[PDB]
């Protein structure tokens, strides 16, 4: 979800809107992803 | 919509390029980096032109 602060991503599929997996970015908000501290290409 | 490269990756590609033709001269280029010191490298600039 591009520029949305996703405190309320939801309130405006339902899977694709809970809270199992929230990443904040600043290109958005990315839900179904984890975040991992190592890096590749 | 932000860019892809923020600027602090922009500036460690410029960073490695500089030290990159400071240390191996123009051979990283090329293939492997070969290191040789400065100051015979500029010698061969100058016989570069004659
Ligand atoms: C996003 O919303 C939260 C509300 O929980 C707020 O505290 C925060 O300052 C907002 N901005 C961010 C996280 O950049
Ligand atoms: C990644 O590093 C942070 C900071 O040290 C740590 O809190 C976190 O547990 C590490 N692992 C993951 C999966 O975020």
Do not use: K
Not at chain 1, 3 to 16: F, G, K, L
Not at chain 1, 23 to 34: D, H, K, P, S, V
Not at chain 2, 4 to 24: F, N, P, R, V
């Amino acid at each position: 979800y591009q520029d949305v602060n996703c405190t309320e991503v939801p309130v405006a599929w339902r899977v694709y809107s809970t809270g199992s997996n929230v990443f904040q970015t600043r290109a958005g908000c990315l839900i179904g992803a984890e975040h991992v501290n190592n890096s590749y290409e | 919509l932000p860019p892809l490269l923020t600027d602090e990756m922009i500036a460690q590609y410029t960073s490695a390029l500089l030290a990159g033709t400071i240390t191996s001269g123009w051979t990283f280029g090329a293939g492997p980096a070969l290191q040789i010191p400065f100051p015979m490298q500029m010698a061969y600039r100058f016989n570069g032109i004659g």
